[PDB]
Design a protein around this nucleic acid. Structure first.
Ligand SMILES: [Mg+2]
Ligand SMILES: [Mg+2]
Ligand SMILES: [Mg+2]
Ligand SMILES: [Mg+2]
Ligand SMILES: [Mg+2]
Ligand SMILES: [Mg+2]
Ligand SMILES: [Mg+2]
Ligand SMILES: [Mg+2]
Ligand SMILES: [Mg+2]
Ligand SMILES: [Mg+2]
Ligand SMILES: [Mg+2]
Ligand SMILES: [Mg+2]
Ligand SMILES: [Mg+2]
Ligand SMILES: [Mg+2]
Ligand SMILES: [Mg+2]
Ligand SMILES: [Mg+2]
Ligand SMILES: [Mg+2]
Ligand SMILES: [Mg+2]
Ligand SMILES: [Mg+2]
Ligand SMILES: [Mg+2]
Ligand SMILES: [Mg+2]
Ligand SMILES: [Mg+2]
Ligand SMILES: [Mg+2]
Ligand SMILES: [Mg+2]
Ligand SMILES: [Mg+2]
Ligand SMILES: [Mg+2]
Ligand SMILES: [Mg+2]
Ligand SMILES: [Mg+2]
Ligand SMILES: [Mg+2]
Ligand SMILES: [Mg+2]
Ligand SMILES: [Mg+2]
Ligand SMILES: [Mg+2]
Ligand SMILES: [Mg+2]
Ligand SMILES: [Mg+2]
Ligand SMILES: [Mg+2]
Ligand SMILES: [Mg+2]
Ligand SMILES: [Mg+2]
Ligand SMILES: [Mg+2]
Ligand SMILES: [Mg+2]
Ligand SMILES: [Mg+2]
Ligand SMILES: [Mg+2]
Ligand SMILES: [Mg+2]
Ligand SMILES: [Mg+2]
Ligand SMILES: [Mg+2]
Ligand SMILES: [Mg+2]
Ligand SMILES: [Mg+2]
Ligand SMILES: [Mg+2]
Ligand SMILES: [Mg+2]
Ligand SMILES: [Mg+2]
Ligand SMILES: [Mg+2]
Ligand SMILES: [Mg+2]
Ligand SMILES: [Mg+2]
Lengths: 154, 119, 161, 121
RNA sequence: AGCACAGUCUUAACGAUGGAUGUCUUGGUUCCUACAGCGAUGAAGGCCGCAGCAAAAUGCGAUACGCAAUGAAAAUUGCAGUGACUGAAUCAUCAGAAUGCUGAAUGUAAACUACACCAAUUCCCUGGGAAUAGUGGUACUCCUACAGAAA
RNA sequence: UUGUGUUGAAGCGAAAUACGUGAGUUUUCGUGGAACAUCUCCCUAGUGCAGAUCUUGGUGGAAGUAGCAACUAUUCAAAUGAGAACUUUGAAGACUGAAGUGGAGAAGGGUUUCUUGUCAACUGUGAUUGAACAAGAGUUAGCCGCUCCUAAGGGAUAGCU
RNA sequence: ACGGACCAAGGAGUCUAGCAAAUGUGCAAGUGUAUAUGAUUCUUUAAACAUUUUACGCAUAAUUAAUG
RNA sequence: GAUGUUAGGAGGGCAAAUCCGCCGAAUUUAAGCAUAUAAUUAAGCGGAAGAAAAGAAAAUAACUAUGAUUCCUUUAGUAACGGCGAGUGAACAAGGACCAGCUCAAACGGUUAAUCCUUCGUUUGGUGCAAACCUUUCGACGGAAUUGUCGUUGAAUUAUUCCAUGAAUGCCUUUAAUUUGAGCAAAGUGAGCAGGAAUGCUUCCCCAUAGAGGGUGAAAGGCCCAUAGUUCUUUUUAAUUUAUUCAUUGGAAUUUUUCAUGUCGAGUCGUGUUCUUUGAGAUUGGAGCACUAAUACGUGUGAUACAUUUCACAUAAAGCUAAAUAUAUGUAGGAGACCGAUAGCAAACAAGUACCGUGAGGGAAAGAUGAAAUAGUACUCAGGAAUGAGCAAUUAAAUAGUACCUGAAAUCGUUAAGAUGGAACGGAUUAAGAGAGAAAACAAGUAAAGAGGGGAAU
């Protein structure tokens, strides 16, 4: 949100008609370059933006619990289906079964290296490689806002 | 260039004497600067620092002496008193705050908030 | 106003923008509260944060049938339990000077509850080891082993609901 | 990362780097030690002092060993014995190397350094 | 050595003018969390100072871009100079010391560095020996206690 | 999601046997010197400009035009200097004409004073001049003032509002 | 008739509240887990998950000024 | 009662986002306007705190009843108010967060104020290097106070059981968290290409509880700082460990049994009347004035003025009190589907600065060379000098030369080509010029032998 009185902190008023100047509010006084300038109003340099953004915009959306549940279920189902998974972009051509289930021994893995090895063994070597490749620096101003890298979802 | 650890041991008169000498030296340097010189213009800074050090040492000694003089005795100079935010000074001491009307105290003693593990 | 719509009723003719609170703090606030309560629990080693409340019937013809936790137990109920008010307060139980009993049955129920609570609870001694019997209401202090055993078991919070 | 007391925030980090006090500067002009040195001491890397003898790895002089002449904490640059360079005038100045791009071989070793080594161990 | 009329208009190439676009970013903004007062023990605010070469800002207060102490810890550097081989050069820390003139401003004043009155005051040495017209104090309201006068 | 970049990204300039009805897209060459897309789907918005006597900044034609005409008036030689109608000296000729561009002060200004330098801009022509720029310097009181008295008046004390 | 010398950038139906219609979606005599709690929830997590081992809303019934 | 520069203390001013008091508008809406609305808002004046305020029932209910305040969800855009127009608009219950109760006054104790404070002291301790602090009980000498301090919360009396207490001997253990700064911290500075310079590209290695972020001559998990993780040390606060003897003053709770039926806040409530405020309606709160009560069988609420009377609920006119709650102020952190230098704070920069205004006030513009100026333009020639030029020079690059990244348009210059009888441009259609161009705008294959690259068969 923009700070509340942005562009409107001035005392400016319009000179009115008979001066051969548009009737935008003007900064008063003299001496500065700012004196006599178009003041508030979306058009003006140093003006307020149009509908200044406010904290009371609706940020979240309530989604029906049931709907959410349904969505979750459908995603699970999708994860099930090989073709869908493939479409979603994963390099899954070398995995046998796509409801891919692994023994509880996995829950005790202590070392990232071991995990990686396991993944490779499974058939996801290619996927892993892709993931490694695809850390790249974002286009645009995300770069300036702690969104430096863009990484594909494994 | 005299650093403080040497000076702590010295007596006050000696310190004073030292200080005067330093001041004289400083004055000389200033005079030189005023006259068309830049030979020992940069010497002045060190001298100044030395003087400051001496002053600090002496001042702390004086403060210590003052403290010794006014040890306890209820009232004291407002310097040697506990300089501390005014509000805090005003505020009731924790003990005072605690102090309980006798009945209340009795009650507390008798029926204190017990520990009682529910099962 | 135009067309067939509800006649507009929007109370925003005052400087409403001045006092809009948007609750960005909700979940985080909740978390903080939880943390605080945990801390409190820790401080009261073993003992429960929560205090015993009597079940009571809600007033008014419409909530009549429903029952919910009131504040505080009524002198009569305490007496029935075999308990002093001060003593009760000192333990985990709430006292309510202003509540009165019209119904015998209700009173009985709450004294039953109180009894149950008493049965449940085991009292840590005030000064260590030295086991002494209570004052007015409070039960006796158990020995060390028993206390340890109790600690090892789970602290039941079924009665406070 | 996982502790939320420290800030990831790029801007903040950059400010810290640029506006650091002298101690911080000293800490962040560290250099990798050679294999031999690593073997000797549990340490991986050290803050570089005056009379250390560095081998430059990156830059135009990828190989020239030399005794460090000066380290300059304003610009984050060490200067080395013979990495000389004429200005437009002719005056022969030293080329600055950032300590990333250097690996230190022979070690200046005062009591402080010894203490540091002990701590690392 | 020659030859283009000139001007106006147009197009292209190559420049000037200007600062758009794009790329940045020690800044802002919003939200979240946390604490939360300063002052007659002189506050905030304001002046005046203070550097070897020093205007601003920054920092500081006649010990004046800093003193002590603590934790780092060999440099600092435009030159001059000062330091190392750790109370030292530089950082951070900052609890000790100190904190000009003002300002509630409070001895009366105020476009005054004007003016009172009371203490003379201060330092050193273990009762003397030195300094300096310098230093404090004195507002109004109020409270408790004391005082000796009043009805 | 699946990609392009110092064997040169965005941008910009000019184009193109280019595609599209069109918004546009695409590519070439040049410059550029570091980022950039995603049309695979949809999410989001401070989302698209020829106008508002729009705002801001810049640039024109007008135009080398209007104009640089109150205060009677300059001239000769020499010096300084790269260079002199307007810097200096001399010689003329003039004016101000003691109700003065003369001496002193007040208000106001604040170092403009002074010497030595000196010319990027400024001194609406020039300029070596200067109230410009830079470096230094300069204001000395028992008697001249303020300081004291009271005036029109002001701010307060007691109360009282 | 008015505005527009030129150029660049900025520059105007937006956001909330509540109602409605439309359409999508879920569930359907129900529906919405509201505050709040709980979790082996804690870079993201200010989301996501969960709902205690007859809350309230709107709807499910209308009508009357009203006792009803 | 004055008086004191008496001894000791306090207030004053700054700051304000939240907060508490007053005071108090109007624009605005009603399509006019006057009550209403804006709004018990802005401004004004005063006052606090880390929160403030509120708060322990003269409460709500009419139930099977609840039980201080606050806050959230709701009740509810409802009851109600309102030129019954515009519009305004609560409360109880219900679900939660959080939960804490109390002490004055009055009653009682006179076989004695038991209270309280100032000054002067005295002597055991505890942490500290000191500085200071921390507590310990003991008197004096003053006062204050009978115009009322302290204890008791009716009073005694019994049975039970607690709590304080002093001395001797004894034990400073194990962890769990919690919160400060602390260190420690995995793995490549490997071949080749192109480059000023890899952090790049093909390729060979690994580490990962660390592939957050930043730095580094271009995109870096492995170059640096940090990051994951752990190791002490700081803060406190739980659990666990050791108490055992002996002294007695004092108190407490329930329990019997007697006797006491006490006390319960006055120019206050209340009514009238005025004005205000409220949704409050024959007045919701408040205030001014007049009048001015009752004692608990009283008086006050029970949303329509009254009488006569039930019933329920409370106990006004004194006071305190943590939590849940709020925060656009300040400081410090941390985040972002935010802005990216005409944006974002007015302010990315010596910004509340310069500058304007007598003044209250008004209030800008202005970021980027390069990796490195510890590469910021040496040298030579022409110049009075600025500058210019170079066979000279830093650079990867100077048409990156400090007005420095990119460098658009308007506008202007140079050159060329073209047109040109009081506009210019444009559309449709060719033409003539002048540029660009082969991806449809010809030639697959076969043969001869060069230069490459692949794939298979054994
Ligand atoms: Mg703005
Ligand atoms: Mg972009
Ligand atoms: Mg011609
Ligand atoms: Mg305060
Ligand atoms: Mg020091
Ligand atoms: Mg030290
Ligand atoms: Mg004064
Ligand atoms: Mg005067
Ligand atoms: Mg693009
Ligand atoms: Mg817009
Ligand atoms: Mg635009
Ligand atoms: Mg435009
Ligand atoms: Mg248009
Ligand atoms: Mg303009
Ligand atoms: Mg013009
Ligand atoms: Mg002239
Ligand atoms: Mg004459
Ligand atoms: Mg005349
Ligand atoms: Mg002069
Ligand atoms: Mg001129
Ligand atoms: Mg001169
Ligand atoms: Mg000057
Ligand atoms: Mg005189
Ligand atoms: Mg006088
Ligand atoms: Mg007078
Ligand atoms: Mg007056
Ligand atoms: Mg006309
Ligand atoms: Mg018109
Ligand atoms: Mg016009
Ligand atoms: Mg215009
Ligand atoms: Mg619908
Ligand atoms: Mg005040
Ligand atoms: Mg109207
Ligand atoms: Mg109207
Ligand atoms: Mg009107
Ligand atoms: Mg106000
Ligand atoms: Mg309070
Ligand atoms: Mg509510
Ligand atoms: Mg409703
Ligand atoms: Mg209202
Ligand atoms: Mg680069
Ligand atoms: Mg009463
Ligand atoms: Mg009203
Ligand atoms: Mg009622
Ligand atoms: Mg009360
Ligand atoms: Mg209160
Ligand atoms: Mg700006
Ligand atoms: Mg290159
Ligand atoms: Mg270029
Ligand atoms: Mg660049
Ligand atoms: Mg440029
Ligand atoms: Mg003609």
């Amino acid at each position: 949100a923009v700070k509340l009185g942005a562009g409107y902190e001035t005392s400016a008023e319009s000179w009115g008609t008979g001066r051969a100047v548009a009737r935008i509010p003007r900064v008063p006084g003299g001496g500065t370059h700012r004196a006599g300038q178009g003041a508030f109003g979306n058009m003006c340099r140093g003006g307020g933006m149009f509908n200044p953004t406010k904290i009371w915009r609706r940020w979240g959306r309530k989604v029906n619990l049931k709907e959410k549940r349904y969505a979750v279920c459908s995603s699970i189902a999708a994860s099930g289906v090989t073709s869908l998974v493939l479409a979603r972009g994963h390099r899954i051509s070398h995995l046998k079964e796509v409801p891919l289930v692994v023994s509880n021994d996995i829950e005790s893995l202590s070392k990232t290296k071991e995990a990686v090895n396991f993944l490779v063994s499974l058939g996801l070597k290619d996927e892993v490689n892709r993931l490694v490749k695809s850390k790249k620096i974002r286009a645009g101003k995300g770069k300036m806002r702690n969104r430096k890298y863009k990484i594909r979802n494994g | 260039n005299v650093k403080a650890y040497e000076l702590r041991t010295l007596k006050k008169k000696e310190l004073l004497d030292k200080l005067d000498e330093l001041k004289k030296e400083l004055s000389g340097l200033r005079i030189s600067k005023a006259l068309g010189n830049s030979a020992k213009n940069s010497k002045i800074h060190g001298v100044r620092k030395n003087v400051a050090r001496v002053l600090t040492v002496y001042n702390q000694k004086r403060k210590m002496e003052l403290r010794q003089l006014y040890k306890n005795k209820k009232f004291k100079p407002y310097n040697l008193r506990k300089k501390l935010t005014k509000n805090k000074r005003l505020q009731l001491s924790p003990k005072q705050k605690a102090a309980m009307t006798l009945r209340q105290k009795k009650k507390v003693q008798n029926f204190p908030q017990r520990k009682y593990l529910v099962v | 106003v135009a067309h067939n719509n509800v006649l507009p009723n929007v109370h925003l003719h005052k400087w409403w923008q001045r006092h809009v609170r948007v609750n960005f703090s909700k979940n985080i606030k909740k978390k903080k509260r939880r943390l605080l309560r945990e801390k409190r629990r820790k401080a009261n080693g073993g003992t429960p944060i929560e205090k015993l409340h009597p079940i009571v019937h809600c007033p008014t013809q419409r909530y009549n049938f429903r029952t919910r936790l009131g504040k505080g137990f009524t002198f009569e109920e305490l007496k029935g339990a075999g308990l002093t008010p001060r003593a009760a307060q000192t333990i985990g139980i709430c006292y309510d000077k202003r509540r009165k009993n019209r119904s015998e049955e209700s009173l009985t129920k709450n004294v039953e509850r109180l009894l149950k609570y008493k049965n449940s609870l085991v009292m840590i001694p005030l000064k260590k080891n030295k086991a002494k019997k209570g004052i007015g209401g409070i039960p006796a202090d158990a020995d060390k082993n028993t206390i340890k055993e109790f600690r090892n078991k789970k602290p039941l919070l079924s009665i406070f609901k | 990362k996982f502790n939320k007391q420290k800030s990831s925030s790029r801007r903040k980090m950059r400010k810290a780097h640029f506006t650091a006090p002298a101690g911080l500067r000293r800490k962040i002009m560290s250099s990798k030690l050679s294999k031999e040195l690593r073997l000797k001491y549990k340490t991986r890397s050290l803050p570089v002092r005056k009379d250390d003898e560095v081998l430059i790895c990156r830059g135009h002089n990828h190989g020239r060993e030399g005794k460090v002449v000066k380290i300059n904490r304003k610009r984050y640059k060490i200067y080395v014995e013979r990495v000389t360079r004429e200005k437009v005038n002719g005056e022969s100045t030293f080329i600055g190397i950032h300590p990333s791009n250097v690996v230190l071989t022979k070690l200046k070793v005062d009591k402080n350094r010894k203490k540091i080594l002990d701590r690392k161990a």
